Amino acid sequence: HSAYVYQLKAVPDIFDEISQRFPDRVALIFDQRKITYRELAEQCSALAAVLQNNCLIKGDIVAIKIERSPELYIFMLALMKIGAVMVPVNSNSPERYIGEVLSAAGARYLISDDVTSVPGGAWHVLSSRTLIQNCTRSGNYPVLSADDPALILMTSGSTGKPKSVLIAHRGIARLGLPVPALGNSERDCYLQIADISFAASANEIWMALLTGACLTIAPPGLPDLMALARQIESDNVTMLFLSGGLFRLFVEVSVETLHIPDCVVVSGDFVNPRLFSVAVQAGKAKIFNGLGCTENSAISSLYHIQSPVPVGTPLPLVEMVVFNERLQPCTCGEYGELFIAGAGVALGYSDPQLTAERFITIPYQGTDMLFYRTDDRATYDQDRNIVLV
Numbered sequence: 414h415s416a417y418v419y420q421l422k423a424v425p426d427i428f429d430e431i432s433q434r435f436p437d438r439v440a441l442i443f444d445q446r447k448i449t450y451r452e453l454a455e456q457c458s459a460l461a462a463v464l465q466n467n468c469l470i471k472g473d474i475v476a477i478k479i480e481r482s483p484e485l486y487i488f489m490l491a492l493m494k495i496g497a498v499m500v501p502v503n504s505n506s507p508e509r510y511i512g513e514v515l516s517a518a519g520a521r522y523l524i525s526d527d528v529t530s531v532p533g534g535a536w537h538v539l540s541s542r543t544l545i546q547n548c549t550r551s552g553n554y555p556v557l558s559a560d561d562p563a564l565i566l567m568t569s570g571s572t573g574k575p576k577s578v579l580i581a582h583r584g585i586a587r588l589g590l591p592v593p594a595l596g597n598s599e600r601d602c603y604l605q606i607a608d609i610s611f612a613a614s615a616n617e618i619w620m621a622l623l624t625g626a627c628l629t630i631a632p633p634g635l636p637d638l639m640a641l642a643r644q645i646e647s648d649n650v651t652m653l654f655l656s657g658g659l660f661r662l663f664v665e666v667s668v669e670t671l672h673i674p675d676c677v678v679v680s681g682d683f684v685n686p687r688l689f690s691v692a693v694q695a696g697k698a699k700i701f702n703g704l705g706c707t708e709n710s711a712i713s714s715l716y717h718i719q720s721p722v723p724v725g726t727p728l729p730l731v732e733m734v735v736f737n738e739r740l741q742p743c744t745c746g747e748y749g750e751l752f753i754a755g756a757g758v759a760l761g762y763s764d765p766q767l768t769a770e771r772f773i774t775i776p777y778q779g780t781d782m783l784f785y786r787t788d789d790r791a792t793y794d795q796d797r798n799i800v801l802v
């Protein structure tokens with residue numbers, strides 16, 4: 414439990430720390446089933462021992478296709494504890510496409526809650542249901558470092574090129590640091606709705622579970638705004654992360670739901686400023702425009718809208734710089750490209766040539782800093798907020 418904020422542990426070590434400090438806080442809610450950190454840590458450890466005894470070891474590439482459920486997050490924590498590299502799969506994807514993802518990721522195993530609706534291939538299919546039943550063993554787990562790989566996520570460039578992104582423990586472990594703009598703590602409650610195959614899901618999962626906060630879990634499948642509205646109220650969601658689609662739809666059909674939480678973060682793409690205007694005038698929740706990208710593991714900057722919206726200022730341990738064509742920091746109003754450095758930067762792509770092109774070391778403020786090149790055109794405003802253009 415170090416006070417040096419730049420000193421990060423692997424995910425399982427942070428979670429062990431949190432589960433010891435807040436053992437009687439609620440970690441997970443699904444429907445009306447609630448699970449404390451103490452019970453979650455017991456289930457995580459029991460499952461990790463089962464996985465190790467199934468010969469799964471550090472660095473094994475392990476895909477997960479498990480519908481939203483408490484067991485999904487138990488598997489994530491157990492796989493992190495044994496050092497496996499998770500490949501989360503979109504359960505709403507054609508089997509065809511899932512096979513292409515598993516192939517591109519090099520998955521050796523696929524853990525599934527429905528072993529009938531999975532693609533065949535080189536990978537070996539394991540039943541999440543059977544493995545959970547075999548929980549009764551725990552010890553001799555790997556000594557993980559913040560730079561060990563934790564997951565593989567798929568993304569695309571601006572012109573459609575598909576990419577396989579290797580994410581380090583540190584990229585999600587940083588979400589255990591409270592975000593000053595949000596004021597979050599263990600008292601908060603998050604809503605898990607973004608699909609696990611999307612980096613944005615990390616915002617919900619790990620900001621909750623690595624801080625002692627509560628994660629209430631949306632029902633599997635496509636968004637049910639009626640149920641989500643009831644869930645936000647009945648489970649007292651206080652930190653609400655939304656895609657541009659979910660945000661816009663809520664503004665259109667139930668803007669007052671957006672003011673049940675304390676903070677609402679909209680990320681993923683440009684949002685019509687008029688939508689922010691309506692939302693901000695409808696109540697007193699803090700509405701943010703947020704930037705994230707897969708290559709920085711999770712949400713990366715926040716702009717509080719008070720009334721092209723800026724993307725604001727970086728999260729803890731994140732560095733953002735707009736660089737011109739000559740790799741010099743831009744002045745206010747000068748156009749350049751957004752580069753991101755710090756704890757969230759990915760380990761690379763599966764493509765080594767693509768990695769060297771997009772992950773570049775640049776001396777900045779006295780440090781030879783590794784930057785991800787976003788391909789996002791940007792500048793600074795007068796208050797030095799970053800604004801994508």
Ligand SMILES: Nc1c(O)cccc1C(=O)NS(=O)(=O)NC[C@H]1O[C@@H](n2cnc3c(N)ncnc32)[C@H](O)[C@@H]1O
Binds near residue numbers: 680704712724
């Ligand atoms: N939403 C996410 C999250 O919360 C956590 C982690 C990842 C993501 C995510 O979106 N990852 S991603 O799929 O790789 N897309 C990346 C690309 O999205 C565009 N983008 C994203 N946010 C904004 C925004 N506010 N305004 C304008 N453009 C935006 C930029 O072009 C960027 O480079």
Ligand SMILES: [Br-]
Binds near residue numbers: 685
């Ligand atoms: Br739109």
Ligand SMILES: [Cl-]
Binds near residue numbers: 438
């Ligand atoms: Cl407690």
Ligand SMILES: [Cl-]
Binds near residue numbers: 507508509510
């Ligand atoms: Cl198919």
Ligand SMILES: [Cl-]
Binds near residue numbers: 573574575
């Ligand atoms: Cl291509």
Ligand SMILES: [Cl-]
Binds near residue numbers: 575577763764767
């Ligand atoms: Cl790649």
